[PDB]
């Protein structure tokens, strides 16, 4: 076919593939057991994004959903990707500040609701209900951010400054990048259709890559990962 944003899918697959190998390589030359924990988790995040980007580049994970008088193109492979990568990122932040089991389970659960309702909204045919789902998905997100900001940050103070300070950088990159997603969804293909798919795809890879490979790098090159 050759859709305009394939170029962006091509750069997403590429960046994610590099990050994967570099983390893999760096992670298997590490003997520390906790370092090993963070490395296994993080190195798992980019490959999952890689395959989902590949398929899309190659033509899968796309479906035409009717609404607005149009047959709209929704890249659902995007959710099959985030469903597994967002909770692995949360877990990565949660292990850092020694979050409790209830917090994690709730952060991950809340995270399950967000990608699920978001997907249901991306699939919904009554135009206005799409925004209802989008609404529930976003509120689930605000709960997660509130927890990362209010809860986690507090427990990171029971950690060394090197640890509390690697966390606030990662928590900040997460608050800023996550904040953007619901807005992209809104003004683009899933929502208003103001921003065309090709610019939306570009916006999405820039965030996906910053939030994954960007997040991983900062985390795995830190000394705070060591037990």
Ligand X SMILES: *C/C=C(C)/C=C/C=C(C)/C=C/C1=C(C)CCCC1(C)C
Q: Which residue is nearest to ligand X (CB)?
A: 118
Asked if 86 is part of the footprint of ligand X (rule: CB under 6 A), the reply reads: yes
Residue closer to ligand X (CB basis): 167 or 181 = 181
Burial class (CB in 10 A: 0-12, 13-18, 19+), 3: middle
Write down the H helix ranges in 124-214.
127-146, 153-155, 161-187, 197-209
Residue closer to ligand X (CB basis): 92 or 225 = 92
Write the CB contacts of 219 (distance below 8 Å, at least 6 apart in sequence): 38, 42, 92, 166, 170, 225
Asked if 211 is part of the footprint of ligand X (rule: CB under 6 A), the reply reads: yes
What is the 8-class DSSP label of residue 125? S
Contact (Cβ atoms closer than 8 angstroms) between residue 153 and residue 201: no
Q: Tokens 């795995």: give the residue.
A: 220
Using CA atoms, how far residue 3 sits from 31, 166, 170, 193, 207, in Å, is: 45, 40, 34, 17, 21
Asked if 208 is part of the footprint of ligand X (rule: CB under 6 A), the reply reads: yes
Q: Quick one: which segment of 31-39, 98-106, 181-189, 218-226 binds ligand X (CB under 6 A)?
A: 181-189
Residue closer to ligand X (CB basis): 18 or 160 = 18
Among 223, 171, 215, 221, smallest CA distance to 42 is for 215
Q: Quick one: which segment of 6-14, 68-76, 82-90, 147-155 binds ligand X (CB under 6 A)?
A: 82-90
Of 15, 56, 107, 141, the residue at the interface with ligand X (CB under 6 A) is: 141
Asked if 42 is part of the footprint of ligand X (rule: CB under 6 A), the reply reads: no
Of 178, 197, 201, 205, the residue at the interface with ligand X (CB under 6 A) is: 178
Asked if 93 is part of the footprint of ligand X (rule: CB under 6 A), the reply reads: no
Q: Quick one: which segment of 63-71, 94-102, 112-120, 149-157 binds ligand X (CB under 6 A)?
A: 112-120
Of 82, 92, 156, 220, the residue at the interface with ligand X (CB under 6 A) is: 82
Contact (Cβ atoms closer than 8 angstroms) between residue 143 and residue 110: yes
Tell the smallest beta-carbon distance from residue 78 to ligand X (Å). Answer: 8
Asked if 115 is part of the footprint of ligand X (rule: CB under 6 A), the reply reads: yes
Among 190, 213, 200, 217, smallest CA distance to 16 is for 213
Which residues lie near ligand X (CB under 6 A)? 82, 85-86, 89, 114-115, 118, 134, 137-138, 141, 178, 181-182, 185, 208, 211-212
């Amino acid at each position: 076919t050759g859709r305009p944003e394939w170029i962006w899918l091509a750069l997403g697959t590429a960046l994610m593939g590099l990050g994967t190998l570099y983390f893999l390589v760096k992670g298997m030359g590490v003997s520390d057991p906790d370092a090993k924990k963070f490395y296994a988790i993080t190195t798992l995040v980019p490959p999952i994004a890689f395959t989902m980007y590949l398929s899309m580049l190659l033509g899968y994970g796309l479906t035409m959903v009717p609404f607005g008088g149009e047959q709209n193109p929704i890249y659902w492979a995007r959710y099959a990707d985030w469903l597994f990568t967002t909770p692995l990122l949360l877990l990565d932040l949660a292990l850092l500040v020694d979050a409790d089991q209830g917090t994690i389970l709730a952060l991950v659960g809340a995270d399950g609701i967000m990608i699920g309702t978001g997907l249901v909204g991306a699939l919904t045919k009554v135009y206005s209900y799409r925004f209802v789902w989008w609404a529930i998905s976003t509120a689930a997100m605000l709960y997660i951010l509130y927890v990362l900001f209010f809860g986690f940050t507090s427990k990171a103070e029971s950690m060394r400054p090197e640890v509390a300070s690697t966390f606030k950088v990662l928590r900040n990159v997460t608050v800023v990048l996550w904040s953007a997603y619901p807005v992209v969804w809104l003004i683009g293909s899933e929502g208003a259709g103001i921003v065309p798919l090709n610019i939306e795809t570009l916006l999405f890879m820039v965030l996906d890559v910053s939030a994954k490979v960007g997040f991983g790098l900062i985390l795995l090159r830190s000394r705070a990962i060591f037990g």
